[PDB]
């Protein structure tokens, strides 16, 4: 419902329209990650390295266990009834997750029954299976390092030296875990954690984890980059040093009667300088309303915008008037920098500033020029079949719009400044003027 | 053209003056990167690993090929004429890049003629050369890993185990590529991509890439950190899994009659509290005008500021009056935190707050004190040859300026608040006051 005809003289050229979709209703898979490697084939020369390693892992995992455990004591079957005075203080998101943690025990319990075989795996990636009821994939951190790089050299490298290499490899691993599972993760109950963070537990190799669980399609890569694929820690075993992680696989749901429209800014002139109109670049339209989108958190594809939550936000009435044609209310900033783009292409048509850009029409050799009455000049193939801007030759299409586009003016709104310091100064200035006028109305009222 | 004499009582002490320079007019070099390793010397035991690897690379590269290819169909030689109705929608930056992509084929074509030898290289870094017309450097991802860590162990590690190690190494590589060449790169035409991102294709080893192409000088390190060195993908070969990358090497051009001046803030007092004056810390001066610079995007050196584009921005008139001496208009914030610095050194002179800092003059043992009439107190070697602030002893120079500096006042501007919440509240407050006054003028007008 935008008036693109008016906006294009202001300097906002219609760009690409995209569809809008948001993550919902996931399916799940459970995977086991071991944080301690199997050192049996080099057990002759591990020194006291593994013992110190185990101690540190308990120090790291103990706070995770304790924190999730409080939402584990404070439920009982009814679905499930959660105890409000037991947890006492919680957010809605935190509560939802605590419920999911409870339901998830059915599987954690069946997985834990396999602990005897989990404890003794000896490969980086292995499938365990005994019954229909209990099967699981197990990933082991650093196992390949040990069986490819240390074990084959046990008869070449002196045992003290192999102890030192194992110790360094383990310390590198802990360093990386600490950025994610260290006390930075002060809330391990919530399920917002991405798979790219969880995978640090296996060396950051999220591809192995995800390929172990599924298969590849182009849509999946979009979900992974849009951060819609997350997981939750459901169980921690401090005696075997492993965690059970639930991975969510979302279904994307598009919003009907909705789209996102982008605009391409072009600087324009009003008097004797260059100016930029300030509007949101991406406008979200739903039904007949216009709202703002915090698109910086959403993956943008050539066809759609994929968000991992609803990012719609409020917009003021002056921007609606701006956008729907009362352009008098559209604010502008001054151009100082030479980096501001001065032209754009839309549907074969050029919108360009020919006061600050050398424009000429190649077909004839005639110059193209802009008077001080136009903001931007519109160039198409009914006036100039082909044209050159700077050093680029562009064939043109036809403007399917008004014929006398370049003959009409548009109202221009006020100058603004957007810098953080400038904003504070503008506030002070307005306040000083308002406070003096308040005293003048008092004198006006008394006399 | 700044009045440093007035600004120093406000709390802004003149710091270092730097030169300003911006990236332009690059020279180029073309390099080939292979995303798939040579596994011939261990071809006996690769399982089906390489086949799955090749499939995933085509899935990753196919969208890059397709996206750049549309600016490849839509040109023909004239320089070159680009088809405006073929591409339809484009930005100026996007168009410029599409032209560069076209011209670049002369070299891509000569490089592609070497595909037979590119396909069969077997080293991490190799030079191919047959003719003057066609030579190229080729970098191969993961090749050293294979010939140093896997191949020498083929007779020690069981073949199934070597297949698993190869698979893990390849999956780690893809994980890293996906942050750059995954569908995050939704526009592979533009040439703004830095070399530090491109180099992820070779394991993030940008030093090997750049040393292969050139030589080292201190100036180069500044260009690399200032992100002025970028490249472009010009060609993708989905049948050999390699890309041809054009690397740009810029010439830095300084701006004449221009400099950047920094100011060092010192808190000061006006009444019974500490205050900080708010100005941009870095001021850009060109000719006789003052403008703001978004220096946070520019490398700062001891001699100059190196930007990879023009970052000059607008400034309000009140800040010009601030800076050129009408200090009544300089806004200030209240100090709450104990972390605010309370002194600075400039050209051997100390500007310090002696109400909140213990100041004394070591040469005599006499205390230095500040009355409530001074903002900051200026201390130099004509009053006190050496002085102590807190626990640091500083010899002093002479103030080459007014002699009675500490005898004169300065106007102080209004209090401000800068917090995001405070800004919203201040706007609401101003609006409520203004709306009530509007009704009062209506009563004043009717009677």
């Amino acid at each position, epitope marked *: 419902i935008l008036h693109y005809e008016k906006l294009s003289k202001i300097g906002l050229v219609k760009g690409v329209t995209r569809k809008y979709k948001i993550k919902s*209703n996931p*399916l*799940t*898979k*459970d995977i086991v990650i071991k944080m301690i490697p199997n050192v049996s084939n080099m057990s002759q020369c591990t020194g006291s390295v593994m013992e110190n390693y185990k101690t540190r892992l308990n120090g790291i995992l103990t706070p995770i266990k304790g924190a999730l455990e409080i939402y584990k004591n404070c439920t009982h079957d009814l679905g499930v009834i959660m105890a409000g005075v037991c947890i006492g203080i919680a957010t809605a998101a935190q509560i939802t997750a605590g419920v999911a943690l409870y339901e998830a025990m*059915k*599987n954690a319990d*069946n997985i834990n029954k396999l602990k005897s075989s989990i404890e003794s795996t000896n490969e980086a990636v292995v499938k365990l*299976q005994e019954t*229909a*009821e*209990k*099967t699981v994939y197990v990933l082991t951190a650093l196992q390949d390092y040990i069986n490819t790089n240390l074990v084959p050299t046990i008869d070449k490298i002196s045992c003290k030296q192999t102890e030192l290499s194992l110790d360094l490899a383990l310390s590198k691993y802990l360093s990386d875990l600490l950025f994610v599972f260290g006390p930075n993760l002060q809330d391990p109950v919530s399920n917002s954690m991405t798979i790219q963070a969880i995978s640090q537990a296996f060396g950051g190799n999220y591809e192995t984890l995800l390929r172990t669980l*599924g*298969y*590849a*399609t*182009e*849509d999946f890569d979009d979900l992974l980059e849009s951060d819609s694929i997350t997981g939750q820690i459901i169980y921690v075993d401090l005696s075997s040093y492993y965690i059970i992680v639930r991975v969510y*696989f979302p*279904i*994307l749901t598009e919003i009907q009667q909705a789209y996102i429209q982008e605009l391409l800014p072009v600087s324009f002139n009003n008097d004797n300088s260059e100016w930029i109109s300030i509007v949101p670049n991406f406008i979200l339209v739903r039904n007949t309303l216009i709202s703002n989108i915090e698109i910086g958190f959403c993956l943008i594809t050539k*066809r759609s915008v994929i968000c991992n939550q609803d990012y719609a936000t409020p917009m003021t009435n002056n921007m609606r008037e701006c956008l729907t044609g009362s352009t008098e209310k559209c604010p502008r900033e001054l151009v100082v920098s030479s980096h501001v783009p001065r032209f754009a292409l839309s549907n074969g048509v050029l919108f360009a500033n020919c006061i600050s850009v050398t424009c000429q029409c190649q077909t004839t050799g005639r110059a193209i020029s802009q008077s001080g009455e136009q903001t931007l000049l519109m160039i198409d193939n009914t006036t100039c079949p082909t044209a050159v801007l700077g050093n680029v030759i562009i064939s043109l299409g036809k403007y399917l719009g008004s014929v006398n586009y370049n003959s009409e003016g548009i109202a221009i709104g006020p100058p603004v400044f957007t810098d953080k310091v400038d904003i504070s100064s503008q506030i002070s200035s307005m306040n000083q003027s308002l406070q003096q006028s308040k005293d003048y109305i008092k004198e006006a009222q008394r006399l | 053209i700044l009045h440093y004499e007035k600004l120093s009582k406000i709390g802004l002490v003149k710091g270092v003056t730097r030169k300003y320079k911006i990236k332009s007019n690059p020279l180029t070099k073309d390099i080939v990167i292979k995303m798939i390793p040579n596994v011939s010397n261990m071809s006996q035991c690769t399982g089906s690993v390489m086949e799955n690897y090749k*499939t995933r690379l*085509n*899935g990753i590269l*196919t*969208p890059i090929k397709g996206a750049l290819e549309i600016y490849k169909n839509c040109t023909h030689d004239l320089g070159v004429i680009m088809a405006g109705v073929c591409i339809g929608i484009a930005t100026a930056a996007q168009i410029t890049a599409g032209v560069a992509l076209y011209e670049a084929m002369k070299n891509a074509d000569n490089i592609n003629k070497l595909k037979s030898s590119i396909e069969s290289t077997n080293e991490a870094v190799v030079k191919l050369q047959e003719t003057a017309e066609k030579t190229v450097y080729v970098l191969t991802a993961l090749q050293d890993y294979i010939n140093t860590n896997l191949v020498p162990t083929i007779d020690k590690i069981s073949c199934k185990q070597t297949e698993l190690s190869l698979d893990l190494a390849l999956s780690k590589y893809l994980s890293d590529l996906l942050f750059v060449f995954g569908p995050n790169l939704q526009d592979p035409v533009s040439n703004s991509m830095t070399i530090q991102a491109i180099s992820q294709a070779f394991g993030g080893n940008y030093e090997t890439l750049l040393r292969t192409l050139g030589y080292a000088t201190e100036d180069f390190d500044d260009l690399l950190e200032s992100d002025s060195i970028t490249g472009q993908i010009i060609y993708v070969d989905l049948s050999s899994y390699y890309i041809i990358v054009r690397v740009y090497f810029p010439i830095l051009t300084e701006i004449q009659q221009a400099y950047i001046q920094e100011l060092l803030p010192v808190s000061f007092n006006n009444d019974n509290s500490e205050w900080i004056s708010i100005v941009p810390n870095f001021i850009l001066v060109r000719n006789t005008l003052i403008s703001n610079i978004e220096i946070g995007f520019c490398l700062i050196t001891k001699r100059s500021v190196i930007c990879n584009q023009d970052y000059a921005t607008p400034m309000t008139n009140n800040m010009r009056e601030c800076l050129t001496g009408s200090t009544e208009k300089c806004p200030r914030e209240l100090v709450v935190s104990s972390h605010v610095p309370r002194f600075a050194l400039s050209n051997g002179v100390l500007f310090a707050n002696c109400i909140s800092v213990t100041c004394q003059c070591q040469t005599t043992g006499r205390a230095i004190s500040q009355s409530g009439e001074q903002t900051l107190l200026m201390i130099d070697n004509t009053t006190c040859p050496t002085a102590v602030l807190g626990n640091v002893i500083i010899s002093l120079g002479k103030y080459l300026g007014s002699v009675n500096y500490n005898s004169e006042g300065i106007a102080i501007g209004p209090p401000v608040f800068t917090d995001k919440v405070d800004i919203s509240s201040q706007i609401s407050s101003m609006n409520q006051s203004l709306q009530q006054s509007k009704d009062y003028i209506k009563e004043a007008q009717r009677l």
Partner: antibody
Amino acid sequence: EVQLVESGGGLVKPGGSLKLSCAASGFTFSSYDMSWVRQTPEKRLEWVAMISSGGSYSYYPDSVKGRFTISRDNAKNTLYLQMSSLRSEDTAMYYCARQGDYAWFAYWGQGTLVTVSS
Amino acid sequence: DIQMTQSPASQSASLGESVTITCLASQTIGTWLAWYQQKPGKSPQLLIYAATSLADGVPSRFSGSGSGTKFSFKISSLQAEDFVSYYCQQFYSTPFTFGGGTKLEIK
């Protein structure tokens, strides 16, 4: 209305070959992954093959992997399956189906018939 | 491979009677299971995907639930038009497979 239409069926001598095709209409072809599903005379359903939305990935059961090729032409809105070395084991109805977000089959065509006999 | 067993192969019912069929997975599959209905002379149609949601256009007569290894499908009030074949399939991992199929008869 989604209208998948299979064709190209018929009688093949064992050891022969046959190319099938399924034209699409009523939805955007280029937005969905698709598959072939086989129904035996005994009414057992079997997955035969799938191809992802952009054509970069495909998957097959071991019994047809290496024999069959699944491909798509997005410009023509057409799904193709190239069968080879046909066996009597392959006599069945062949259905063209459109997948949902994972691998449930939301839309099915009428199906065509492939018969292998000497 | 993941396979599942569907049973009873056949059962009878009266019109208006409630009926249930079950599939048992060889290995746990979460809720990654779908149910289909096939009429004679026609292709199968989807009724229930992801174990518990109904497909667009599916009558309220149909419902289902289950997770892990055991899944079930229910018709609360069987119509003459419902005495056809029913199938379950897993979409947990490739190869995707279908169960044997079950048939309702009229008493």
